[PDB]
Amino acid sequence: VNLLSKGTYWWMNAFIKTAHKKPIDLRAIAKLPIAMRALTNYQRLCVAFDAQARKDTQSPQGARAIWRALCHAFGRRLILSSTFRILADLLGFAGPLCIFGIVDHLGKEVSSQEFLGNAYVLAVLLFLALLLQRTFLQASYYVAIETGINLRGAIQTKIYNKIMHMSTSNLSMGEMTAGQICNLVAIDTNQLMWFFFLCPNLWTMPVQIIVGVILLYYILGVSALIGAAVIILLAPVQYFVATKLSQAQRTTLEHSNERLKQTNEMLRGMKLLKLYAWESIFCSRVEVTRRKEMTSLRAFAVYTSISIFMNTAIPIAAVLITFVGHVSFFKESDLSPSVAFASLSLFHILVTPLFLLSSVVRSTVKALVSVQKLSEFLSSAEIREECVQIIGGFFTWTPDGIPTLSNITIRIPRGQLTMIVGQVGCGKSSLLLATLGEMQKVSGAVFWNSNLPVAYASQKPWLLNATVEENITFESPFNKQRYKMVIEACSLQPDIDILPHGDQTQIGERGINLSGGQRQRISVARALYQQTNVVFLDDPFSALDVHLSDHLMQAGILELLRDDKRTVVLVTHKLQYLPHADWIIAMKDGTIQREGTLKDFQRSECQLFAKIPWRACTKYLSSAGILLLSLLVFSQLLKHMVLVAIDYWLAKWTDSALVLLDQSVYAMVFTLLCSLGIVLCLVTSVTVEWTGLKVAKRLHRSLLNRIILAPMRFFETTPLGSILNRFSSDCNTIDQHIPSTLECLSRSTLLCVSALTVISYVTPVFLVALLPLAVVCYFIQKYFRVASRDLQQLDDTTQLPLVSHFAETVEGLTTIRAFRYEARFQQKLLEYTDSNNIASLFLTAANRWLEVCMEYIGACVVLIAAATSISNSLSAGLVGLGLTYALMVSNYLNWMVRNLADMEIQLGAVKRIHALLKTEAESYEGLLAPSLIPKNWPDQGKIQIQNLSVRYDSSLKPVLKHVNTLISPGQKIGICGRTGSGKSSFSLAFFRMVDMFEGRIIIDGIDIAKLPLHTLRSRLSIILQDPVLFSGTIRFNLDPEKKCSDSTLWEALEIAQLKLVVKALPGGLDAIITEGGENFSQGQRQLFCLARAFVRKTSIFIMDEATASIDMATENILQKVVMTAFADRTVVTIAHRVHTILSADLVMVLKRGAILEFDKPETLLSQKDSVFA
């Protein structure tokens, strides 16, 4: 890696010259460099622990031990970054001296004093200095970022390894949870990282302050000292204010997150919601919640207003009160223009320190908190790194207090089938997990030679977020026949058909979390597939289904078939393999009788069984409102148009002081002129604050109404998370941190134009050099927008699977400890951790390369503006604007490009306008061939199917073919359709929610074509086969409607046997329906929906195929509700198990992908005959 290029990043050239042609992948990203490989960085830091193992006063480690480690860990390279930061800031001060030396020499008409003569000389010295000044600051930024990158994994590995020695009794799910270590990755690493991003500056920024003060003092003196203290002492007002901003952010998330959870609630069961036709109330609850969310973001704006304001006003507010003190209150010194310009030059320089200092103080304190949160975590209880026998042990599920099981001996040699049974809890999975060694074995011995002289599945499912076949893999090689000898041997093929892509589907997170009869079944699959010797399966009949338990007996018969002298030692509860078992159970509350033979046992007990241009107009010009957007224009214009003009006065009035109406009268004019922008800047801060507040209020209102009427076929076709990705991230983008980018950029780019416009007006042949120059400025930017985008979205796709690895590492901790797969997963830890760090490198690479290449360009401006500006002799005050803006180009094009880059990312959120607005269909009501129709009630259950020819999506295949059917009042049609072509296709279709390609549907006599679907589909009962539990209040779960009752609400739900089962409600008839059906049953969950079906008062309850019913007695109570509570209408008995066809009134077995036969009466035909089959 070559050194002057290691200065200015020349290796990035061919990278980005690559990047204009091809898009960029992780393959286009590289290997890690030798030191940047994370395990090396981990390696040195463990040595730093061993170094302070020599100290060992109280070595938990602890925080005092940590920072003594970390300083001697990374500090040498940190010193090098600090040294460049110092020397650069020192030459940061030298430029102002150069300005002073020019104008002082140019008020006029070998020795070093003579060598200090010429503005030729001093300007060239200025240029050649300001190369280094504008270079070593981008060394010192760089190396410090290439320090925190080397922090990241070298912390994260220590974290992850302590997870590899973590113990799990109550602490692992109590005080600290998966989230509580997850944010500890997600925050406290970055708290450390941004600390070491800023760690030089806390050493150094006050030295920049004090030497800025002293090099102001040798310009004015006591007027310097009285002027400086505003800008010095007023920066911790930012430390006051941003504290309130953090307080507002705490107010933000605490009010946003539950709302977003309720948005996910409204979105997940959106099909049932529009099936309930309940978009209005469900959206209205989020709408009035949003009113308070806006009221919180109101203060978020009021906080973020003055941050900008005091960041911008206090420069001028210092500079004027500095000068009026030098003019009025003191009046001693003559005021040269050289003074007056370079005074402002330092004033421009010193702020870019000063309003980072609060963020420094914040981050330093936050990280010093976070190291304690790291430490007091990190010194918690380890997991005691130290045939299947147990020789008389004393095990404890607890840590070293009260034991759980003593005197426990067991033995399981090879070639053996053994379960363990008893009472749950005491062996919920307990004694098997005690065999794992995941308990405080206070005494006794145990033998596998597993550690020193292994498969498992947990009683809770801990799957992985991957492909389903990859979840079946669980760090395995491939054998697709053996996989067919597993997956088909598990019979997950129906669940694989329920998956959209089967073996290539999306298991874990972002997928339908099915039952353990799928999920834990897939775990038992990866268990059996694992090609291990000994297995420990856990009570899978509790997770299985009934016929799945029959297949689980068959899977046990495939297990022992697959047990080619294996040692699978399961445990269960049922009496199924109580006949078929090699050895026996032992659990009463501890060691029950042994595994040998139930002959001499108590078996009687067991025998009981480019850019985005128009999108900104879609942001603003469609939604801003014109008058405030015009104020956003004009206030931005007229602020800077008087700001640089205040500097234009600030030269020439002192040029008259260099000469000699009244200049003291000129000064108070200038004073109030400086006060004018000080007045304006408040309205400038209030503009974008109020603007983005109004923008996001209507934008979120619009997207709410946009999704509020969309058809359900879309939502089945839409991946629901891709919608909520527009609601979670993009909304918070548009609210919390969209417009500050704009307010920065509108402050930025005008000043970028403006300083050029000044130096143009100074020298009329400036622009002749600018025109080749700004070419280069543009073409570097034009390449740059490609790269910084592709890095930034790369970043976005990178640390997310990194912490996803953590979450699975938390949850499936036990099972990887069982497989002893830490070596695999520490490797695959790195395999992400690397790709984070190398992406972060190339991000922070072009983060440097851009501005340093643009910075030399800015320096070229300086010299050219100087050399042109020599001819003002051939006036002299008007030089001083040139010099003061020549040096002030840099922070401008620093931000003026980078923010324009990040605006493109900020626009990528509001790209989802088209995902919202353009996607719009399905006017629900409003067709309405009558305006007057009280047959939304109907007392006549004679529906009709007037040769209705429906298509599914009007895309691939029809559902019917001219079905000229009808219905009779009381004719409860037992629905019998195709096993894979027409099952659900006649209920939501009967709610007109599909592409009925021909044929009408007469309802209460009249066709349902032009009728209010909001009125029709809400006054029609349908108890579908999805668990519909709207979280909230109990009356809100029961009756969130207009004519809500409590007597009838307590009547039919007692007829549903829920208002008497939950008669001990916490709030009674207005109780809280907490968690959306996590405390109530799975059966009364639907019985409350049956009471809602009573509440519609048109009880033609179109039920669905309730294939997941736990109690068949509860389904018989539902049959009693079909008997007693269904008031003799056309119950469309959709049945995946045709057992419920036993109560047929007038069925229509319309099947084989078609309309087979009207099944009434006595139709025990080839489906009802094969209903037993």
Side-chain angles (χ1 to χ4, degrees), residues 1-16 18-20 23-24 28 30-53 60 62-63 65-88 90-107 117-165 167-172 174 176-222 224 227-229 234-256 259 262 269 277-278 288-292 298-301 307-310 312-313 315 317-318 322-323 325-326 337-340 342-381 392-393 397 399 401 403 406 411 413 415-416 418 422 425 427 434 437 444-445 447-448 450 453-457 461 466 476-478 482-483 489 494 500-502 506 508-511 516-517 525 527 529 540 543 549 551 555-556 560 572-573 577 579 581 586 590 596 610 613 616 619 624-626 634 640 645 648-649 651 653-654 657 663 666-667 670 677 690 692 696 700-701 710-711 713-715 719 721-723 727-729 731 737 739-742 744-745 747-853 855-871 873-895 897-905 908-911 913 915 918-919 921 923 926 929-930 934 936-939 941 945 949-950 952-953 958 960 963 969-970 974 977 980 982 989-991 999 1005 1009 1012 1027 1032 1040 1045 1050 1052 1056 1064 1066-1068 1071 1076-1077 1081 1083 1091 1093-1094 1099 1106 1108 1113 1125 1127 1129 1135 1139 1144 1150 1153-1154 1158 1161 1173:
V1 196
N2 46 357
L3 190 144
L4 259 299
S5 297
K6 293 173 85 74
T8 59
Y9 305 136
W10 207 266
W11 69 313
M12 184 48 63
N13 295 322
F15 186 81
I16 57 94
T18 302
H20 177 75
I24 303 302
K31 70 280 179 193
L32 276 179
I34 307 299
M36 305 304 290
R37 300 167 68 251
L39 193 143
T40 301
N41 296 311
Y42 169 74
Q43 186 64 255
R44 186 169 67 244
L45 187 137
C46 291
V47 180
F49 295 107
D50 308 325
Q52 200 169 355
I66 282 174
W67 283 84
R68 292 283 191 270
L70 264 299
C71 292
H72 192 72
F74 289 168
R76 184 188 296 273
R77 187 75 70 182
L78 174 62
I79 288 300
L80 186 60
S81 65
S82 302
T83 306
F84 285 109
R85 182 61 181 269
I86 299 165
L87 297 178
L90 292 174
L91 299 175
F93 297 148
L97 301 178
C98 294
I99 302 167
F100 182 70
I102 291 165
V103 178
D104 286 322
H105 186 272
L106 266 70
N118 209 168
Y120 280 165
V121 170
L122 274 302
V124 176
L125 185 61
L126 168 67
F127 167 70
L128 289 170
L130 258 287
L131 296 175
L132 267 300
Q133 196 279 132
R134 298 277 191 250
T135 311
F136 278 170
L137 193 273
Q138 296 302 319
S140 183
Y141 261 150
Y142 165 70
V143 181
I145 304 301
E146 198 193 359
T147 312
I149 290 177
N150 284 313
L151 280 176
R152 178 183 287 122
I155 297 172
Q156 282 175 353
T157 304
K158 284 292 295 186
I159 302 168
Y160 186 80
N161 200 0
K162 195 256 178 64
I163 305 168
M164 301 304 109
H165 301 83
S167 179
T168 59
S169 178
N170 54 0
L171 75 165
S172 176
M176 63 190 73
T177 318
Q180 206 277 335
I181 196 64
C182 179
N183 54 3
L184 193 143
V185 179
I187 307 299
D188 302 329
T189 310
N190 302 316
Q191 301 307 107
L192 262 296
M193 200 181 297
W194 285 95
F195 172 67
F196 275 153
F197 289 174
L198 299 181
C199 186
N201 301 333
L202 71 102
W203 295 6
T204 313
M205 206 63 70
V207 181
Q208 303 190 5
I209 294 165
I210 292 168
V211 184
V213 164
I214 295 170
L215 294 175
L216 174 59
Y217 183 77
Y218 278 172
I219 296 172
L220 291 180
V222 65
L234 199 62
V237 178
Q238 182 69 43
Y239 172 58
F240 181 79
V241 167
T243 306
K244 302 291 183 182
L245 191 73
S246 67
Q247 178 176 0
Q249 188 178 4
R250 294 282 78 76
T251 310
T252 305
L253 180 59
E254 75 189 1
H255 194 273
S256 69
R259 175 185 58 82
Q262 289 180 357
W278 284 358
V288 185
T289 307
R290 186 67 176 177
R291 302 291 183 91
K292 300 178 183 180
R298 184 181 294 173
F300 181 83
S307 304
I308 308 300
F309 174 72
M310 296 297 176
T312 52
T322 305
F323 287 160
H326 189 276
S338 68
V339 169
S343 66
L344 194 59
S345 305
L346 288 174
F347 286 166
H348 284 296
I349 283 173
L350 286 176
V351 177
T352 303
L354 261 287
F355 282 95
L356 269 68
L357 185 60
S358 295
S359 63
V360 175
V361 171
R362 289 289 299 275
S363 301
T364 51
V365 175
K366 283 186 178 181
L368 285 171
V369 171
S370 301
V371 66
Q372 287 181 353
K373 291 294 184 289
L374 179 62
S375 310
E376 300 172 355
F377 162 70
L378 196 276
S379 299
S380 63
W397 171 248
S406 178
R411 178 172 170 83
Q416 181 177 357
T418 305
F447 296 98
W448 297 267
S450 68
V454 171
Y456 171 72
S476 73
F478 276 102
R482 177 74 183 278
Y483 171 73
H501 301 282
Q506 295 83 15
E509 285 292 325
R510 300 179 181 178
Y529 186 74
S549 67
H551 179 71
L560 56 92
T572 180
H573 57 88
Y577 278 160
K619 184 258 181 297
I626 302 168
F634 282 164
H640 295 171
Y648 169 75
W649 188 271
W653 171 61
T654 58
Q663 58 88 30
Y666 289 167
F670 168 69
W690 187 261
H700 187 78
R701 179 177 292 169
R713 177 81 274 284
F714 167 72
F715 296 101
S722 64
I723 296 170
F727 282 95
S728 174
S729 178
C731 178
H737 55 87
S740 67
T741 311
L742 283 163
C744 175
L745 189 63
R747 186 184 64 188
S748 303
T749 313
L750 302 180
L751 299 177
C752 173
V753 176
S754 304
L756 296 174
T757 305
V758 168
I759 291 164
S760 69
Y761 178 69
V762 175
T763 60
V765 294
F766 182 74
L767 82 159
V768 183
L770 176 143
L771 186 63
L773 191 274
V775 165
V776 186
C777 179
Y778 180 71
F779 283 164
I780 291 172
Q781 182 266 333
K782 190 180 77 171
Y783 282 166
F784 182 72
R785 284 195 286 123
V786 178
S788 179
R789 282 175 66 187
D790 301 332
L791 298 167
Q792 197 67 44
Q793 292 102 21
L794 183 63
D795 188 8
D796 303 330
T797 58
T798 307
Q799 56 90 28
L800 171 67
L802 184 142
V803 297
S804 303
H805 194 76
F806 280 104
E808 295 185 357
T809 303
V810 172
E811 297 295 328
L813 174 65
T814 307
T815 309
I816 279 90
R817 298 183 74 90
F819 292 120
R820 297 187 293 267
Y821 275 185
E822 64 275 9
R824 288 172 182 257
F825 271 176
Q826 286 184 355
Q827 177 66 39
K828 298 174 186 179
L829 183 73
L830 297 178
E831 294 177 357
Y832 295 158
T833 313
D834 304 327
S835 296
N836 193 1
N837 295 315
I838 189 66
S840 305
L841 280 169
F842 274 164
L843 178 67
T844 194
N847 191 356
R848 306 279 72 64
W849 172 67
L850 173 72
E851 39 83 20
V852 61
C853 291
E855 205 164 357
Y856 287 175
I857 296 306
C860 185
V861 171
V862 180
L863 180 143
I864 292 301
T868 54
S869 186
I870 307 301
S871 178
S873 299
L874 199 281
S875 174
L878 303 172
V879 174
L881 264 297
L883 269 295
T884 191
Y885 284 171
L887 300 186
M888 281 303 288
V889 65
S890 306
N891 302 317
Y892 296 165
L893 290 174
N894 205 169
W895 293 98
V897 182
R898 185 184 308 280
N899 308 332
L900 191 273
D902 295 336
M903 187 67 72
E904 194 75 26
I905 293 99
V910 78
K911 183 61 70 177
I913 289 301
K918 300 283 102 176
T919 55
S923 69
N936 197 8
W937 186 54
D939 52 354
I945 313 298
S949 299
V950 63
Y952 174 73
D953 203 4
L960 296 177
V963 177
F990 194 75
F991 283 102
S1045 70
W1050 198 70
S1081 73
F1094 176 75
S1099 68
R1129 285 187 178 90
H1139 174 74
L1150 299 176
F1158 179 72

